[PDB]
Symmetry: C5
Subunit: 205 residues, 5 copies
């Protein structure tokens, strides 16, 4: 197969509305945020404006092809794929996608989607101007798929962080959690990302 | 049936433009706001910028399937479903939907749609910096379907509200009302949501 | 007929690009603004930010059905209908439509479309802080259809009936009058409704 | 023919990606800006926010019909027409179109497209608070078509300016410019609009 | 062939989702920024708002036609073409495209795409108010195609198209080839690093 044949097959049999569950087991979605910049912090309102790469991986076996004498991977527009309906539960702006909306599909059906996102959050900005810094927690999970349909798992903290930010990263921790909504008995899995950061140049003058 | 068959059937037959009235009774729509954040308040202009989850449920029997050896629920893009034409009558900004535009459909045709919305309102902000706080009333009902076509029913306070807001919720009440427009004799049902909130000390 | 049949017929025979003229008479479009809020006023720049319901009615006989044992009215997405190409000639922002983009269609082909719009205008804000107030004129007409294709008419109810009690401003008077403009370029006249909003800052 | 038949024919045989050149002559595009408002001026940054009607006309003979017992003109959505790929070379914001995106098509194939646009420009704002005023020059041309494919020609310009603006128009001049760049052998046309305005 | 036939052929067959690799060589993409304006600079936050022409060229032989008694070039909407998935790795805003989204296609399959973009960047603004000025580095490369699929190469006066009305002036522009690696994957991504040396006029 060549790239043209693989992309044709995906475009033609793309069920983007259909979650690719295998034998009624959940789709395992891995999520890791790589922080690139912290642009605005407001200690009065407890709001932060951040740029991050949202590394997202899952399997969709309906995409798979025989890689013998074929590409091992192709770039696919996400409009041609099912993508997990992830939301940041404490976002106060829509995610602004800064990058081309293409995912990488591996011949075994693994999908890697990593948009660069600018987004504003409600989180704890207290201590940003101190040595120990602020800890802003961001919670990401499926909006509509509970734990029997989607599982969410986490996958240098400053490796891609801008050296030119007014802020610096002290630590990033990413832990699995579970939330319940009042309407409904099912739990939703989430990743809770704790961004420990502080303002550069905190000497009193 | 599997998910692929159910979603195919819904996409092919759901009639998103067709209100799913049964035997000329109104469609019963339930609406409840869960307040998540209060972002900006202006006591001079009487404007508030709020984030809320708009829990919306109704029945559409045209979506129903036999759940024997089948999923009991599916996630469906709202572009493939009829959705009630709800509007906040005192909104001064378009609703900004922060979440994926998917609804949950149950095999009996019950639909659950709960977008996270950021929206600005004209309401009473007087007393926000006092112990008793401000009471901002938000009115939500059908833009085009009167009470013979859509009924709106409300059916805890602070449960999902951000601990990091500058504001705190003292009380939320959600009560059924009716409005009439000058053009037309028919009443439109609404839910009136009273948000009692104050600036934290 | 049921709602499903009527909406199917409209969706299938919808010519949304085709003005529904009858026997080469103009389409009579009625426009009435119901002011809901005055949000920002700048007396230096002569700019106002207003929210209004734009009550818009016209006839499209291609939509009509026999109402015997049928609904008298249905809700239709405006993407399935011809709608008049109305513009506010002194708007300085795009109209922000706050409401679901549905119209009501009556079995005789009458259409009622009433979006809630937030929009900014260039108009006379002088006198806003006085007892007699400011008079801001908003002109709304067809962008491309002259008077032989579209006529715009005010309708024949309290000016403040839907106006927010929480606005910093109050309405003293609203008048809505028919106006015609003829440009040097072109022989044809373009109709508008001129809406005069007399308002002031509350004491 | 009636309006329904003409609009059907246009929608069905619309090649909106195909420039309507006749016998390898350029498409003659006329552009005139009618200034409506000057909203924000910054003399420090040399930026202005303006509202104008962009009167745009050209011929597309593929649209033409016999006007005997037929309308002389119809309103057509611009998504059903070829439109010139005009850009304002000194714009610093996307054009905000304030009006319905319809053009008028005449039975001889003339197209009249006149959007109301709000747009921000980088131009000379120096002297805005003086008697002689500022002169802000706006250059509009085809982004991808050289002079053998599109010619741009100027066609009152101040007549419909808002009496309520903080600013007033002293003069508008609109001239043709033809530019050959070092990169490329072909000439590109533009219209250069000089807006002489001042604070009242 | 006339323009209508060429544009019909491209619209029917161009495969915009398909990278036009020849015999498993990478697609050679040339990228050069022409700076038009510097609109806002913040020395505290190290942010700049810039307008530039992103001159972008590559070959797609699936677009080619016989130019005998035919146009040598046509204008094509980029929705009908494969375009490289270029991103500015240090952008902090979406690219605002100010121009019609059309490319020029030459009869040999060369594509020339040059959008005018307004975009905000995180870069070194230190020294902007000094004689030596600031040097702001912008890195542009493929978001999803590594060096075996896309190669990036740089291709007049640095101020030739720069606005005389900017508060800033350009001292120098240099454009060099580099490579980046991401943690997920062993493969390198080629980029152009554009160094904009500029200062405040006043
Ligand atoms: F002011 C008010 F709340 F009492 C009110 C709200 C809405 C309203 O009419 C709407 C009914 C749905 N379609 C048209 C507008 C009348 C009064
Ligand atoms: F300025 C002018 F005289 F050149 C001019 C102005 C307007 C015009 O047509 C208007 C009437 C139809 N709706 C908006 C444009 C033609 C010429
Ligand atoms: F600089 C350049 F070589 F990249 C370049 C410059 C100008 C140019 O054409 C102009 C006229 C047509 N619209 C774009 C600018 C093309 C390339
Ligand atoms: F920071 C940096 F410049 F060193 C850098 C930039 C980009 C990068 O990886 C991207 C390559 C294409 N896929 C998305 C990530 C790694 C480092
Ligand atoms: C993949 O292709 C190879 C080589 O042609 C062959 O061994 C095999 O049939 C294929 N594998 C599967 C699982 O279909
Ligand atoms: C539903 O499923 C069961 C199991 O096959 C079937 O026997 C029954 O008739 C069905 N009933 C309805 C009403 O769908
Ligand atoms: C292109 O067409 C011309 C004229 O019809 C013909 O002479 C020639 O063989 C063609 N050229 C190529 C390289 O195919």
């Amino acid at each position: 197969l060549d790239r043209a044949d693989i992309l044709y097959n995906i475009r033609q049999t793309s069920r983007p509305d259909v979650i690719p569950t295998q034998r009624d087991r959940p789709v395992a979605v891995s999520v890791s945020l790589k922080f690139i910049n912290i642009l605005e912090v407001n200690e009065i309102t407890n709001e932060v404006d951040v740029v991050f790469w949202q590394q997202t991986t899952w399997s969709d076996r309906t995409l798979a092809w025989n890689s013998s004498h074929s590409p091992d991977q192709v770039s696919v527009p996400i409009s041609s794929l099912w993508v997990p309906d992830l939301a940041a539960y404490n976002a106060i702006s829509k995610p602004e996608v800064l990058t081309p909306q293409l995912a990488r599909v591996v011949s075994d059906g693994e999908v890697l989607y990593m948009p660069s996102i600018r987004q504003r959050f409600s989180c704890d900005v207290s201590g940003v101007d101190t040595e120990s810094g602020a800890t802003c927690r961001i919670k990401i999970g499926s909006w509509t798929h509970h734990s029997r349909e989607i599982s969410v798992d986490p996958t240098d903290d400053s490796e891609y962080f801008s050296q030119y930010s007014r802020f610096e990263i002290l630590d990033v921790t990413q832990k699995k959690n579970s939330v319940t909504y009042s309407c409904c008995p099912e739990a939703y899995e989430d990743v809770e990302v704790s961004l420990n950061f502080r303002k550069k140049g905190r000497s009193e003058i």
